[PDB]
Amino acid sequence: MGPVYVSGYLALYDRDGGELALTREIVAAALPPAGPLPINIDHRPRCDIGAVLAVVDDDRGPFFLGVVNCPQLGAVLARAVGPDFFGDMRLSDEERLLYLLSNYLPSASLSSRRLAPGEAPDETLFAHVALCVIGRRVGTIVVYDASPEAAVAPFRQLSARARSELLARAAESPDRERVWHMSEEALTRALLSTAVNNMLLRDRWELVAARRREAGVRGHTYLQ
Amino acid sequence: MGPVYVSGYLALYDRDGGELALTREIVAAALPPAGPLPINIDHRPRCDIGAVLAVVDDDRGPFFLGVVNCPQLGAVLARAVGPDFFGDMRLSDEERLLYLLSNYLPSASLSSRRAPDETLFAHVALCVIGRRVGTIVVYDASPEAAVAPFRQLSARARSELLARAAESPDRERVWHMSEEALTRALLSTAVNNMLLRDRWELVAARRREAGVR
Ligand SMILES: *P(=O)(OC(C)C)OC(C)C
Ligand SMILES: *P(=O)(OC(C)C)OC(C)C
Ligand SMILES: [Cl-]
Ligand SMILES: [Cl-]
Ligand SMILES: [Cl-]
Ligand SMILES: [Mg+2]
């Protein structure tokens, strides 16, 4: 086991309706987070598997870089797949993990505190980032990779400024070398929860492709 | 935890290709299965949650009725659903299990061994998509309700099915399983199906094939 990195937009300005929309003003008030934001699975409490290392206010929206480093995750995922799942392919442990995570949890969801009537946004606003199948906000696909620079590279419209600032802030996060241990039983439950809550979702792979387009990540072709 | 009943066609005559196709003669020789047919999740060993109570040779294909009686199954599925999934509904624990099973494991898959006789059929695995045409299942609180939605199931076959199932020795059994093992089996179902495209279209087609409305 070693750590893996995850990144993407947490929202895109002007791209959501109503209650979901995150405005430039809210994001400016919310950053930097008052404490580090954890990364959990499907908003479940007690199943943190990483932490956001940096959030940047890019021109198109707030963009994050996270680390996921739960030793048991690879084990639980590998035990779940049938014996001939990867066929003839030879892959490292790290690459199987990346493949399964990428496809089991291809999106992110930023969760915020519910503010009271007339309570102003501040740095306590953002609570956590949940990995999920489809986020409710436009363009909230994630990329996972074995290093931070590779995790962020696919986002073609991320500005260079914001990219540099992001990578710099992340390189000095307290959470950068942390490890999140969980029992296998707890992790298994957390992953099953994602499946059960998303079982009814229609057209999930077209929705994933749409999120990818919205984010500016080169679309996955399936024509060969 | 009263038991769960499950039913459906194990195959339809004249509808599968080659390796999957079951003929009438072969089916007639295979019934009645000469020992009880376990019900499991995805053909997994050490993962029995039920048994087939009867199979009948309906005009359209072999049709089964089973009982699933595994206390831990209800608990594992119910823990998994997020706190808003049922809206402002209040479901009983049994109605919730029925719903979640219905949608988590909507199909069945009959496995055999390799002259043909009553030992041929081995077990029935619950799954997301069965390889054979029309292998949807219905789950419900009684055998009557479990078989009701199959419009094309013959009255004769339905009556023979319900009567044999009412006499089955397995009808009151219980299958205690560890929550840990169950949670693994269910997670395996999700990971092995995660990449499946248009799953609910394939299920709707299975349903139409079985003659469910
Ligand atoms: P998120 O996108 O939710 C935030 C709007 C709180 O995740 C969904 C899939 C529940
Ligand atoms: P079943 O339909 O397979 C029988 C033909 C053994 O299960 C599939 C999903 C493998
Ligand atoms: Cl009849
Ligand atoms: Cl799909
Ligand atoms: Cl679908
Ligand atoms: Mg009913």
Numbering used by the authors:
A (entry chain B): 1 to 224
B (entry chain A): 1 to 114, 120 to 218
Sentences from the paper on this structure:
Here, we report crystal structure analyses of the active dimer, the diisopropyl phosphate-inhibited dimer as well as the non-inhibited monomer of pUL26N from PrV (224 amino-acid residues).
The covalently bound diisopropyl phosphate replaces a chloride ion at the active site serine of the native structure. The quaternary structure is a homodimer related by a two-fold non-crystallographic axis with an interface area of 1,273 Å2 (native dimer) and 1,258 Å2 (inhibited dimer) comparable to all previously published structures (~1,300 Å2, determined by PDBePISA). Overall, B-factors in the inhibited dimeric structure are lower than in the native form. This is most likely due to stabilization by inhibitor binding. Moreover, native and inhibited dimers of PrV pUL26N crystallized isomorphously and the diisopropyl phosphate-ester of the active-site serine is quantitatively observed in the inhibited structure. A putative cation was found in both dimeric structures from PrV.
